[model samples]
Target chain A: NPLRALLDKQDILLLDGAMATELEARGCNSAKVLVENPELIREVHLDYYRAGAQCAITASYAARGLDEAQSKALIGKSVELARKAREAYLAENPQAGTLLVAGSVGPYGYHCSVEAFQAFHRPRVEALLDAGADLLACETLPNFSEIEALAELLTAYPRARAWFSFTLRDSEHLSDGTPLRDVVALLAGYPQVVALGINCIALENTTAALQHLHGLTVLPLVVYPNSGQLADYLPQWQAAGARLIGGCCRTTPADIAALKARS
Target chain B: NPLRALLDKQDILLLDGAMATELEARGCNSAKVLVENPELIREVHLDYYRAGAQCAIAARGLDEAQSKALIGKSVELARKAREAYLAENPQAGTLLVAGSVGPYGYHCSVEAFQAFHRPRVEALLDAGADLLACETLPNFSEIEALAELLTAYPRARAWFSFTLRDSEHLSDGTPLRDVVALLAGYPQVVALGINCIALENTTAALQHLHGLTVLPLVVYPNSGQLADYLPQWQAAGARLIGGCCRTTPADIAALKARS
Candidate 1:
């Protein structure tokens, strides 16, 4: 897996924080801003990279709710936008190591059938993959069925690898109340699942929840709590064996800079 | 709950088939038809009651998209339609009005769901709805949101239904057991079941709910599909049976005939 290759070099991969939150702060409608203004998205990605994040996620979360043609073009542009940032960032800092662009296969909780779920994701997944995403960043999943459908859908594209992170319901389960045990059980079947853990949850829930999740499996734990303060929590998370760490909603570039400094 | 009282009398409560289906048969928007033409909505309910439907779900917004689009006139209009129908038919049997609280469309957070659902739910409840028909729901979080929201309205009772990905699982891959488990905690939910599913899928789907909860299993399969399989559905343990999608007043009449 590409994620596995990254972990081989660095002890931990630092992922970018919530792209939507940051983009909105820049005066646009999160992921939808990609369709309106592409440069703004690139600037945000470049911001995160400069903030010391290695894995920059695309602004493709809200790419749906439009026609298929428009949605596909937007999804592709999300990756294309991130790649431009990666290229620009690498050019500016030639000695930088392992700056990767992960395809933002965001949470779509229409809770459709297996067939519908696959159909909704097939185009975006294909668009992200075709546009040269390093790996699938299937982030902020609330439901396991979506994951199940995604796993089955990925069978059609054997080459795509992903790091699945979720918005937790609590310290112990996914946002849908699926126990971490069950989450791990389903994920164990897919070797393509490089990492798994919490994201977009409150910082107060982060360490304790990470503690609950530790030793569940050998797969690397990935976490990016929303509402900041990774400085206080990173040691606890890393001790709990989190191999990928970053911030989510409302967390800024300053948080990443601190994470890189201390972690 | 009121549903318990009805089940006390009847072995199987025969619910009316699709109101939206019949409304569209006359050439208008399904749920949105209430806003444009109130009389048609009344007649549709009256026709179903004439065919012997015990419970007629009010012609409200089928999903959150229209609920937000047309706003909260559905419940108000449905209440209007029901009153008009009752005035026209004095001999109509015991009929209950279940406000159609269909899917909220996007299953994000509980807060977003509550915000999306509150206005419609409030208007429905305020408009003297007998109960809620939470149908075609596909996700646990949205259900969790609905469950949480229902706790605030203690006087309100609802029957929870879902869209099936298959006979064994919810549209989002949640097992029937999990659905039963989550809903078991909510006494406000008077019944548990599936809707907007195919007739062939109904038996195996409802079978998954049997003995999982004391809550009566509901099945409102779409199309003219359930007309032939009433006995099979009853045998499969569906206590509350109805139709959805293309099922018409004729379908409801057939269900009442054998019911």
Candidate 2:
């Protein structure tokens, strides 16, 4: 509630975290860093706040709590790390009472298969909500099932903010050829979601998705498409619409500057 | 019953009407000739019977009683003209009775609409409908109403056929798509068809329609595409295919050979 209260005061703010892979290259599994290096997570949060990000999210998207093998292997420590990371960000960014804390939740790494997707991950979503995650974020979802499961998880956290975001494959349509109209219709209800948006669509069809977004839904739509065709773009997210915006993978502080500049 | 019996027993055949333009050229309005040319109508029937066609139809598609009322004769005369044509072709040799019902109810003629259509269907069914074909239909939605009317003539035979435009996208992969899927719910429909289309578009288009449904399809393709037409639909398939518009006995013989 306090997180949402702070967000309500400042409708626009930067939420910061590191490039998960960059941290990985430096021998930091993102799952452990949230706890093992609260100072690092806090430093990243403060850098975004100082750079004018109104709020920051815990570096928990890579938290292994979102999966089974990953969770069983890495979760207990990750949750402790997430709690520590949240404490660090909130402590450092206190002057901005409107500063919000979002609990980042990405899909499990090996969650592309239909069976593994439903079986291993949905429980973790409920776990995050029960753990007092301020926002139940579903990032880079590939299909409807993951979103639908997230919706189920969000129902438990009625007071928490839920943002259902998607990653588009190569075509204007989804990997399964479901058009945007179908996806929007699937997420039709559920007012708890503060934003319904798209991220990481292939650069070629980004305009198609943008045009489709305008036509298909009346929801508070948000999009942070990748800058160019890259092997993988994550972490760096730039907010495009009137709400939450940032650059994801492969994006830099300069890109974030340009994004904030445009905003 | 008689038409069904004949088909079961004999190689039942039909002599289609004269070319629309040719009938128009003979000083008879093409529509009027179908009503007034009893002698010519009988002769066409006789030639087809002689050529081994077991059925013949009245030229009343455009010349219905309602249609005749506007130009000169009353509806009764057109009715009598139809009766006269039947009287002239009384022999049973390839002269089975057939009637033509057009969407004459359309194209800016209301009384001409019902008069040409409404009573003639029942009268034809009564007089002796070895078969009743509501042919060359363009407004597809009207087929269900036609099906409703055909139900009254239960004792007689009936079938509905559509005249596809030269757009071959109806069946073959060559831009031709199937038409069978369009009329899925109507089962009493004896023959789902693709006739009066370009010859080249007929076979494959009809073949595709045939493939898409379990219905027994009929493709009565026209012969010799107009200077305004092309021989593009020649490859469509139909269960009991035939020809119209400008087809002849020789064409029928060729079709028999090929089909």
Candidate 3:
């Protein structure tokens, strides 16, 4: 409810930029950096925080090719690093308002059935909740079936709050070829789904995507465009009804810092 | 700094009521309950928390009569009790645990002054106090020495609240004006004000402190049922409010509801 509380009070929640983008720029790729250089992850989280991000989505965006135990532990470690960074950041900036650590639950491919998809995403959700994430970020999702899987999985943890964003095929459709209006209709009735929109896509498509999202559902609209672009079109995006804003791919701390300025 | 941040954000922070008041009513009179009835201490903390207090000052208040080891135990119980409460009511977000650091009834100076307090402080910090409640301080040089100790452990932060001699001075006869003059400069001392004093005296103390320093003021006066006085003290700028002596969880709950 902290996220909801902020959105209700402040009317905007500033999110952090891509973790892998920041990682790869440092010669690292994917979440393997979680074990190889966790301090690097901490520093990256801290950088986005100092850049004025209110939320640090955990670096477990790709939980690939691992056993359940390692996968769960890796997800837990991502939250720990974000927490340590959060405390360090708050120690210095005591006056900072409403910081959060969002656990990332990325897409687990469209090839699996809904039941298999639920089985795959279940442990990550448990790991994130066990590690004390303020909320879950179910981002960069491309498949509608996986959305159904998550909806089913979420019922097992009724207290969990999450936001869902997709990789767009266009302004009005999801990458799985499902209509965005259909996506909005299903998600709107689920109270646990706090917000939804498009991420990890081209900048030009963001406003139009948000345009299709505007008033389609009462849920808060979110947009974090990142096929590598600055936040120069916030006026257009906000006008199109994107209240939760950040960068998704190839965006830097500077991009968020500039976004903070405009928002 | 977390306490400071809370005050800055919420306008007022509610501290738990007197630990001994609850303990004595339960047929125990001192911090000896830290060992003999430690679970009793956690329940007291949880009760106050359920009563809606945001910060639980540990039951090491009468450390004057307890072992140095008991000081650390106080922080442990507070932390566990906090975890217990949050597990049941996670919606409360972040509740606070304060390591109660008293003056050791100061007067003597030296390696002795700093050394006498350091063990208790280290134990409290090591056991994970969100902040140190450097309360009931009656002496000036002792306060300064504690300030230097925080310099040694640069990560630790504390709030320095005093046992007032009257409405206008510390128990050591240092003018409240002078305590303000000294502690206002220390970054480690996040808030500055008075505790363990009369309700009337606390209001007078806050009135003067409001003029003496720009630092956030913390006030937990003697006794409880301070709801009628809440608006007055808040208007006078008591950023953090609670009870000191003869106050209970119900007292804390009353203030919280009105808050």
Candidate 4:
């Protein structure tokens, strides 16, 4: 039941991606599955697995501490939703017990000032972990403080794996100009981390960053690149070097299928 | 006497600028120094000399043979027009004269290329030029041909100058990349410069190109500061510059005083 093993054994995990923009476009920003809409979340989860996804994240991307009030309600509901998603997949494809649940913890709380970073994230990450979450999936954290605090908090609870991810700048450098090599070197101290990777950055820059950071850390790496030249390019996280792949922002299910095939 | 001494004594020369855009705005696609507006060109020459500009260039920036054919004009007429404009000013001050040799001969025939450029050299040099200027024209091959022609002419004892530029990313923006190499070439080219494009592009590019080329850089830029929504060239570099187009002697005097 280890998510890392599941990711390695599976040819590709079309981890159901891009929940935020899709949800908004559908006029359903309210956590339909985790806190509220079980059916919709399950439907997306099931479709990706059917299309060959080994894992699917909870519909709680923006639902971190800063999520709208209704989405905040889904903090615990997300785990409930992930468990149900696993159960439904098992029922349909028993042979694919390879399915794993990922609690979609976004860095939306990154906007919170550094002084309040820990005070804000301690609850959200702790709640996601307590609710049968497979791992602490911190994605798209522009501000490193959220990941730093979340990793710090996850240290106390080593049973919950820390899968820290960040979105880098177009230059593949951090906002403060920390190159990927240094970022990886800093992240290596955390033994609880199962994987270190990037998501939602332009694929070329993401690829460059991953290339630079690849051997710097001991933990497994993950990458989920936005399709093309970002706003100018197109939607969908491109299929570059994703050990465990998925999309974010404008990515689509077809993008998932494309990414899954690449792996 | 050396041409440098003439420039040293006279300090700066005011070359008429923005002939294309100003003429374009005035509903004339063509401007031939005194021919298009004899009074205006004469007044500009008189006023510049009155305020202390050492020289003036004809407005007919060498259009190609086909362009001249298309426009229905001759180089002699253009050359004569500049002579007439200067005649009106008739300054006792050293009148450094230039014939506007544009891109026509380069476009027409390389062998005949000098025909377009050399005649301007001959006319201005014979007109007792303290400096012979070829303004607002570019194309490396043509610039070299003009340079080669001028170096051989002892009578054409004037400072040899060429205006080089690259397309701006914005409307009327000037590019420094094109002229950096030319500036570094130095002595062969008496004064390196930019002209015609908006002042901002010229200034931004000049400052950027200045470090690249170690020469006594000279700039005769337009009046309008902004071109294609960008800031004007005057504001980009230090006050050490000259005003070219749509500018008055007062503007040049102010620019000189500010620098």
Candidate 5:
């Protein structure tokens, strides 16, 4: 709800950095922490919220290979934990304007065939939408096959807003060598996809990649580069037209706090 | 071991195929089966041994972040399978247990089977496999990394297997010949070949590898309706022949009979 509200504001929205790295820093797998210790997952969301993040992406990114019923439950549980964390943060800090919980839908390779891959991802996508996520975050996709698979499901969920982020081989290409602009152009046609950007890529390549996207599509560009850059590089990304700037793998709350301080 | 002895046989040595598929068919994650259900993994190895496979690759599919201890457990499971098989039938032939080292890309992201894989190779080496089988790689960079790792630990042996994009090249467009040529310099690399590819393309790919290098060639075509291609592989100079996904023990038995 606040993500929609944040779009109206003039300032760029700050999203939380890597959930896996943050969780693992305290000895946890991104997916395993959700069920093994929901409290840890809760504490992570709170840390990002306290660090001044406007959005908290759910830890359902690797929620694959479960039965249909259990998979849906875990996916829904991820959103619930995030939503609860935000509600707790908002209750404690009345001045904090609004916080959003974006459901994460990561890549799939459970079965070999294209048809099997789509079948594998469909349940997770549907569960996220059904759970009423603020937006479905399809993050760190490697190839067009996965991007196309997620886009088709997002199309059917007409009311669900989603963001699509990709990892790059270089500044210009997807890991599979598909041009970054080609993927951006493909997602722009899907109205349900609200933002298009790249994540888990080298920090140095982010600004140039964002600049390339600036010319390709008008969708709100979102970037969460890996935390291997100087905090000083944030300004360059802000200048390059990245509407939502954040960190991905290896980024910590201190990094998010620093970004917030700069903002 | 039979795997070392295979080099002297001067004929095609058959390896078992599709450890994951066979396990999944019976409701198990082949990787997790090493810990959660070692019995299942042992059974698959036994089935292949009965089918006349000279080598049984352990069902250890690891990603980037899995602990090296898990890899150790996988090798242990494979060893137990071998020990049990030998005890049951003294006349049964020897079976080598290769620790399966997947591409580091699997840990990096989904479908990133082509990503650079040094950490994975390190983890596998630390786990103490009888030999390493780096299979289903989509890119040349991963194979190169495996080769370098193998080179450093000269006592360790590995086979760098690629998943094909077509008959002529690997998934990343690197010619299979180029990969074979690159690894040919590394004596620690026991063989160079292909895995998880279509049955129809197996013979032609072997033909290409034969043209490229003197290193022994391996092929484990996907389970398709193939009418016995063992003779075809033997003619083209393939030293290791097996099946991959969808392949069953029945198929391995058929392959052994033909060989």
Candidate 6:
């Protein structure tokens, strides 16, 4: 409810950029670093917050290919680290009202069949909700099957809300050739989905893609295009109606800071 | 020498299909089973040998997150499996043992295998494969890195295969022809083709590769009605034909029938 309330009050809500790439730059493994050195994870989150990101997407996306038990543990720890970073940041800056932690669920393999894909994702989705995510961010999905699988599963956890994003194969469609319009319309029936948008697409195409989705859904849009530079594009994205914005891939805390400064 | 010997004789050698999936089907981690159940790995190789496969790739890819120490151990285990299989079946023909070099991006995330590949290739070389099999590559950049590394290690013979974006280009939109031309000049790259792609797209992709390079081509389409494409691969002149993901010993047996 606070996330919704925050969205209502704030003109632009900033989310953190690439957790895996940032961790990789630190010269440590993204998957193991969560259990081995969680402080590093919290430090990245705090860096984003201090740099003006209103949300910290947890490191769960980097924890792919783990077993059920390890994934569950890491998913819980990822949320804890983000929440802890928010707590640490607020203790000093009491004026910075509240920050959100959206649980990340990344895409399935290109070659993975739909049935096996859904079976694999079931545990991770349940784990993220079980770990108490503010909301699930099913980001970087490749096909309609993955998005559909996630949407169907989200109904089981009726109280938990999510934002669904797809990586584009081109400006018009998802990687698997599903039309972007069909993707947004599919979400039209699902009220539990708070916002519908796109992430991990090229920055050049992001604004046009957002403009395309803006015509399809009355729901607030979230846009986190990859690549380091976004300051110049922030105004264009905001003008195109991206409510929640930030970065992915090569983006950094400085980019988040730039986003805040520009917006 | 054995791989060279085999390659010299066969126009199109049959590689075994889906060692990991087949192993997983038998209920074991393809990695852990290498130690706990060497017999399973040996059996898969032996079955492939009986089915007329000339190459048995070691099931040790997807180690992008593993330490060099663990990959080294797995390489040793893969070698042991080869030795054990050979010891039991002296007349099993020339089945070369190739160490797998999976995409580094696979270990990072699942959307697409987009991470840099040099570190993984370096680890694979240290593991000491008979020849490297850089499978499931998604982009030209990683392919260039692996090729450059193999160029440096001139004694190493390897095959580079890609996961197609559609039917004509890599997942990163790199044209298959550009990748072939890049690898064609490299002496260490013995073969070029496609893998982890749908069966329906396989024939056209292979057909596209037919006239591009003098180097032999590899095609291991994911399991479907592969029977339909077996004759198509033969017509297109594939040097190595096999299966991936859901392919089975039976699938290899069917390919062997046509080969």
lDDT of 4: 0.53
Binned by DockQ into CAPRI classes (incorrect, acceptable, medium, high), candidate 6 is: incorrect
Lowest lDDT sum, 10 consecutive residues, model 5 chain B, at B106-115
Give the TM-scores of the predictions, in the order they appear.
Answer: 0.48, 0.40, 0.49, 0.43, 0.48, 0.49
TM-score of the second chain, each candidate in turn, equals 0.87, 0.62, 0.91, 0.58, 0.84, 0.82
* Local lDDT at B75 for model 6: 57
**What TM-score does candidate 6 reach?**
0.49
**lDDT tens readout by residue for model 4, A147-251:** 566667777776877577787765456653456666666677777777778787765566566665654654556666665422221222223334566666666
Q: Candidate 2 on A138-254: residue-level lDDT in tens? A: 677767666666665566555767676777754345554556677777777776776666665545554455556656665555545555422122222222232555556544333
lDDT (0-100) at residue A131 of candidate 3? 91
Worst 10 residues of 2 chain A by lDDT: A229-238
TM-score of chain A of 4: 0.79
Give Cα-based local distance difference scores for all models.
0.76, 0.50, 0.79, 0.53, 0.73, 0.74
Q: What C-alpha RMSD does candidate 6 show over the true interface residues after superposing them?
A: 16.4
Query: How well is each residue in B239-258 modelled by candidate 2, as lDDT tens digits?
Result: 34445777655555444344
Candidate 5, A112: how far from true, in Å?
A: 7.2
Question: Which pairs clash inside model 5?
Answer: none
Tell me the lDDT of model 4 at A166.
Answer: 82
Stretches off by above 4 angstroms in model 6 are A60-67, A110-115, B1-259
- Candidate 4 regions off by >4 Å? A7-12, A20-29, A32-36, A61-73, A108-115, A170-172, A228-241, B1-259
Order of quality (lDDT):
3, 1, 6, 5, 4, 2
* Model 1 vs. true fold: TM: 0.48
In model 2, what is the error at residue A18, expressed in angstroms?
Answer: 4.2
C-alpha lDDT (0 to 100) for residue B196 of candidate 4: 52
Error of 1 at A84 (Å): 0.7
Model 1 segments more than 4 A misplaced? A24-26, A29-32, A62-66, B1-259
